[PDB]
Design a protein around this ligand. Structure first.
Ligand SMILES: CCC1=C(C)/C(=C/C2=NC(=C\c3[nH]c(/C=C4\NC(=O)[C@H](C)[C@H]4CC)c(C)c3CCC(=O)O)/C(CCC(=O)O)=C2C)NC1=O
Lengths: 48, 161
């Protein structure tokens, strides 16, 4: 009386992205470049 | 009150003994190096404004401290900061002339850390500014005198941290 294929269970992935190598490089770059000086702008010493 | 010669005298007074040969030798060393200390102290006083300018340029300026929200963003805070460095140098040179690190602890280092903590001054930034002053003061004073000045400057930094 049992159902061999009851239903297909969703799975929560163990490996969280934005820790994966490519995004991690990119996240580092966007953060660090934002904190650094900005090209093509008149005022840059004013910004915190 | 404490000075180098006075502290030797005070220790002898606690003993009650007449002046020992060791006490005479230590006092003689103070008498001997007073000349170099005095000349350097005069030089420091003459170039005091340039020294604090050099120190903030080398350590405390062109950074987030003087950029907005850095505890120096406003003119009041900046004026107090250069004033604080000036007082640090003045009492340090007092103590360097005296030869005894006790004087700075009596005045400069009495509650200074607690006051700075309460007001939100960065202790580390003050220490690095003091070290930058130490480099500038060593340059102006010269190695022999600057080494003596550096010890008492470093004592001030040790009290801060
Ligand atoms: C909220 C109040 C406040 C203000 C305004 C302020 C400004 C300010 N101006 C500075 C520098 C300076 N300010 C000037 C100013 C001038 N030179 C000239 O020829 C002109 C006549 C004039 C301006 C129109 C210069 C030349 C420097 C750089 C000094 C140097 O590095 O040689 C510095 C030190 C360098 C740094 O930014 O770390 C600060 C902090 N800081 C403050 O907390």
């Amino acid at each position: 009386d049992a159902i061999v294929v009851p239903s297909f269970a969703p799975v929560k992935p163990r490996l969280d992205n934005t820790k994966l190598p490519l995004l991690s490089r990119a996240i580092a770059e966007q953060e660090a470049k934002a904190r650094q000086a900005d090209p093509s702008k008149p005022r840059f010493i004013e910004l915190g | 009150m404490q000075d180098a010669i006075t502290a030797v005298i005070n220790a002898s007074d606690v003993q009650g003994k007449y002046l020992d040969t060791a006490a005479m030798e230590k006092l003689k060393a103070y008498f001997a190096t007073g000349e170099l200390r005095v000349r350097a102290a005069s030089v420091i006083s003459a170039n005091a404004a340039n020294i604090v300018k050099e120190a903030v340029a080398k350590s405390l300026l062109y950074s987030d401290i003087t950029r907005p929200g850095g505890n120096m963003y406003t003119t009041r805070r900046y004026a107090a900061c250069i004033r604080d460095l000036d007082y640090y140098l003045r009492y340090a040179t007092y103590a360097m002339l005296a030869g005894d690190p006790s004087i700075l602890d009596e005045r400069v280092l009495n509650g200074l850390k607690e006051t700075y903590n309460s007001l939100g001054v960065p202790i580390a930034a003050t220490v690095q500014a003091i070290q930058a002053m130490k480099e500038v003061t060593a340059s102006l004073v010269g190695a022999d005198a600057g080494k003596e000045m550096g010890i008492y400057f470093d004592y001030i930094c040790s009290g801060l941290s």
